[PDB]
Ligand binder design. Structure first.
Ligand SMILES: CC[C@H](C(=O)Nc1cnncc1C)c1cccc(Cl)c1
Ligand SMILES: CC[C@H](C(=O)Nc1cnncc1C)c1cccc(Cl)c1
Lengths: 304, 304
């Protein structure tokens, strides 16, 4: 028992981190097979970032201008190309530490682990959710660009995020591994609106099931509700509307605990309307939305 | 910017995990050089755990009774010995993946990363603090015994914890790597009292400094206090008494922010006396005590 915001073991991803330098800019790259992926803004100077013309900036660069170092060893760059907001540097050596991997574009509300890196060196790992507004609330300083987000299924790493930018509001934006931004963001030093964010309702419900499994039960009540009634409350409190697809994914947790999904919705409704009255749930004094139903099942069953 | 409960990259520790089986019991072991360390209760059956005589139980075991498997490969056991509550199995092969390492006994209030494992396989990593009462609030299921806690200083892994037991209250207890329990716990299936726990005051203050650095400033006030006045409040709220040693370790954060330590104490005093009034600090609705002053500096500066 016990319930923690657990990240995936980062070993498989640590073996892929490299440092990429172009001119005076250094950031992180991801070396998989004979390709190194990194944010295309590695080719910009500080003055270029105000309004960069990436195609023109890349044209002044040759393979030898991209310095890629894997710890201590230097990689020989034999090709370069831009795909959306990422650069792909073809190298002459396949990474011997390349795990089995996939590139996946995750949905908002899904979770993943981030391996924060500086100068190609891993510094820490944490679990987070892609917000409904396609930002992430990470921990990133200058030099962290190119750090990646991922999930692990047994021996396969599904890379879903590459860090690119910190918005003026302190939240983070980045791309999938084909260089497509999540959300409306562009890789330019301009003020950019992240949408209104909402709380990931299905994740809060999953976490309430994790609380019951672990013995935190005070919030359970004698009430039930309907999806329509619940969604009026979700609306008022800026929670995502719950759908039957969300109820279906909560099925295993409902089965394990014997608490019907709409009954857990009535508990959530009362917590939204009354607050926690100074109590905690799984050591939190707010409703947690960074665990998906799959995360709860994995953690509560013991998946490696 | 952004502030997260970050764990160390677990790669160096993943390479040391093995599965250890003795009879019908399987748990995790730590393979460093030519020695595998694991909880001595691997030699117990369920009926033995009520009141085990470990010396007598170990005497019925030979080297060939300990099955150690590193992923797919089998290790040959050429020696076994008990040191306090850990078993040390000498193997004929040095782990090729042994990182630079130290065994350290941490102080209560210090933090570390745990790599939760099942059957020798890493499942997840999370950061936690050793409570003032020498328990940890982890996430551990049956089969997680032998999972370790550690810190990383550049290339050196300081192992500080090995998981042994879940108390009837759902909190966790374990040993240093010489097999000495942290706290009064014994490796026996008996109800055991964990002391009264307290909040790690110096860590909450460190986290309030991390909040100011990251822009969460609402809790700053026009007041100051003294160590004596503050400790009367710390007493009332079951916080650890603050000492000049704690003030000294907060010095770098006080210097970086320009907020004198006793002024931050007055902010903490008001938060203890008034609560958060429904506001949050770094996304938390309670006072967080799982970041040491060193953790805050490392995270806020970018240490790899
Ligand atoms: C030059 C990096 C900079 C940025 O926001 N990166 C950082 C990443 N994470 N935490 C802090 C910083 C400073 C940037 C400016 C404008 C657009 C883009 Cl794509 C990137
Ligand atoms: C046989 C393991 C058991 C235990 O508490 N382990 C577990 C560890 N973590 N989460 C759950 C469990 C079940 C145990 C009983 C009594 C003493 C000792 Cl040293 C260990």
């Amino acid at each position: 028992s016990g319930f923690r915001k657990m990240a995936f073991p980062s070993g498989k991803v640590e073996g892929c981190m490299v440092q990429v330098t172009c001119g005076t800019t250094t950031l992180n790259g991801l070396w998989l097979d004979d390709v190194v992926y990194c944010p295309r803004h590695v080719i910009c100077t500080s003055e270029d970032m105000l309004n960069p013309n990436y195609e023109d900036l890349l044209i002044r660069k040759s393979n030898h201008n991209f310095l890629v170092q894997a710890g201590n060893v230097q990689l020989r760059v034999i090709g370069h190309s831009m795909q959306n907001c990422v650069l792909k540097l073809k190298v002459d050596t396949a990474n011997p530490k390349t795990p089995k991997y996939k590139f996946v574009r995750i949905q908002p509300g899904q979770t993943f682990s981030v391996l924060a890196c500086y100068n190609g060196s891993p510094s820490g790992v944490y679990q987070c959710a892609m917000r409904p507004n396609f930002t992430i609330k990470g921990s990133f300083l200058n030099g962290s660009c190119g750090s990646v987000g991922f999930n692990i299924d047994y021996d396969c790493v599904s890379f879903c995020y590459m860090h690119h930018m910190e918005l003026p509001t302190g939240v983070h934006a980045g791309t999938d591994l084909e260089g497509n931004f999540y959300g409306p963001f562009v890789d330019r030093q301009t003020a950019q609106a992240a949408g209104t964010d909402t709380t990931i309702t299905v994740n809060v419900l999953a976490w309430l099931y994790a609380a019951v499994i672990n013995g935190d039960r005070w919030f359970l009540n004698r009430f039930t509700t309907t999806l329509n009634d619940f969604n009026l409350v979700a609306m008022k409190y800026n929670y995502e509307p719950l759908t039957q697809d969300h109820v279906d994914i909560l099925g295993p947790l409902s089965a394990q605990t014997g608490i019907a999904v709409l009954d857990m919705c009535a508990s959530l409704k009362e917590l939204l309307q009354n607050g926690m009255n100074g109590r905690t749930i799984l050591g939190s004094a707010l409703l947690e939305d960074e665990f998906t139903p799959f995360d709860v099942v994995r953690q509560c069953s013991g998946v490696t």
